Design a protein around this ligand. Structure first.
Ligand SMILES: Nc1ncnc2c1ncn2[C@@H]1O[C@H](COP(=O)(O)OP(=O)(O)OP(=O)(O)OP(=O)(O)OC[C@H]2O[C@@H](n3ccc(=O)[nH]c3=O)[C@H](O)[C@@H]2O)[C@@H](O)[C@H]1O
Ligand SMILES: [Mn+2]
Length: 269
C-alpha cells in the first residue's frame, strides 16, 4: 500500500500512532511525506531518526522548515526558540541526520500512479520537464559541499515570475520559493510571497496556485503539504492538500493512494 502524510513538524507521537492505525509495514508499504518534518512540534529528533531509518520505504520532499533547520545547522541563520530544534541540533548524530536530510529530493514523481509530490505544490508556470530540471538543480546545490552558500542565497522574495532566462541567484530563489513556500498566485501565475490565509479570506486578485490550470496538474495528480490554513479542504479533483496542522493543534492526515482512503490522527497538543 501507498500512504501519503502531510507536514509532521516534530509530531513524532502522532506520526507513529497514525502509521500503526494503517498497519504501515515497510517492505509491503511505501510512505510519502510532504516535508516540514521538523520544527514547532516536540520530537524533530525522533522524527528525523525514524524517517531516515525507513530508507527506500519512504519518499520525502524537503519543505521550508527543513531548509531552515539546515540553515541553522550550517550557521547561516539564527535558531528561533519557537522551532524547538535544540535537542536535534545537540544530538550526537546531528551530522549524520542532517547530511542525510540535505540530500533528499524537492520533488517526487511516480509515473505509474501519475502522481507528483512537492512541499508547496507545482507552480502553474512549470511543465513537468522544467519542474524536474529545477528540482535537480537545487538538489545538486543542497547535496554539495558548498550547500551553506546556497542556503544563504535562498532567502528572498524575488523574482516571483518564472522564465527560462532566469539565471543565478534569482533562479535558485524562485525555484526554492516555488517548491517550498508557494501558496497564492496572480492570474499570470506569478507567486505572491506574503499572503498565507485561506483561499476565501485572501485579497483579490489572488488565487491558489492549484486554481490556475497548469500543464502538470492537467496530467498528474499533485499531493502537497505546507498550506496549513487551507485545512486540507477546497481543492480540485486530483489535488491533495495533506497538511492539516498537526503541530498547531489540528490533525495529522494520511491518505492511502490505492483507495483514496483518509486516516486521521488527532493532535496531542
Ligand atoms: N488552521 C489555521 N487557520 C489559519 N491559520 C493557521 C492555521 N494553522 C496555522 N495557521 C497560521 O498560518 C501562518 C503561516 O502558515 P504556516 O503556519 O504554515 O507557516 P509558514 O510555513 O508560512 O512559515 P514562513 O513562510 O517560513 O514564514 P515567513 O515568510 O518568514 O513569515 C502561521 O503564522 C500560523 O499561525
Ligand atoms: Mn508546514
Amino acid at each position: 500500500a501507498t500512504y501519503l502524510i502531510g507536514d509532521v513538524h516534530g509530531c513524532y507521537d502522532e506520526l507513529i500512532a497514525l502509521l500503526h492505525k494503517v498497519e504501515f509495514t515497510p517492505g509491503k508499504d511505501t510512505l510519502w511525506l510532504t516535508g516540514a518534518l521538523v520544527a514547532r512540534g516536540p520530537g524533530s529528533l525522533d522524527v528525523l531518526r525514524y524517517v531516515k531509518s525507513l530508507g527506500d520505504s519512504v519518499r520525502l520532499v524537503l519543505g521550508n522548515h527543513d531548509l531552515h533547520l539546515l540553515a541553522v545547522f550550517a550557521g547561516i541563520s539564527r535558531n528561533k526558540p519557537k522551532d524547538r530544534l535544540t535537542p536535534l541540533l545537540e544530538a550526537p548524530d546531528a551530522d549524520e541526520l542532517l547530511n542525510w536530510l540535505r540530500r533528499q529530493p524537492l520533488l517526487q514523481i511516480d509515473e505509474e500512479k501519475k502522481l507528483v509530490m512537492a512541499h508547496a505544490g507545482i507552480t502553474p508556470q512549470w511543465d513537468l520537464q522544467t519542474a524536474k530540471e529545477c528540482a535537480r538543480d537545487v538538489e545538486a546545490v543542497l547535496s554539495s559541499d558548498s550547500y551553506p552558500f546556497f542556503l544563504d542565497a535562498m532567502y528572498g522574495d524575488m523574482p516571483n515570475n518564472w522564465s527560462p532566462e532566469l539565471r543565478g541567484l534569482g533562479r535558485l530563489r524562485f525555484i526554492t520559493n516555488a517548491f517550498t513556500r508557494m501558496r497564492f498566485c496572480f492570474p499570470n501565475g506569478q507567486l505572491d510571497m506574503y499572503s498565507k490565509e485561506s483561499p476565501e479570506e485572501a485579497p483579490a486578485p489572488l488565487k491558489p496556485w492549484f486554481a490556475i490550470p497548469g500543464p502538470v496538474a492537467e496530467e498528474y495528480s499533485i499531493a502537497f503539504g505546507h498550506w496549513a490554513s487551507l485545512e486540507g479542504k477546497g481543492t480540485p479533483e486530483g489535488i491533495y492538500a495533506l497538511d492539516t496542522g498537526c503541530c498547531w493543534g489540528g490533525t495529522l492526515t494520511c491518505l492511502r493512494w490505492e483507495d483514496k482512503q483518509y486516516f486521521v490522527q488527532p493532535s496531542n497538543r
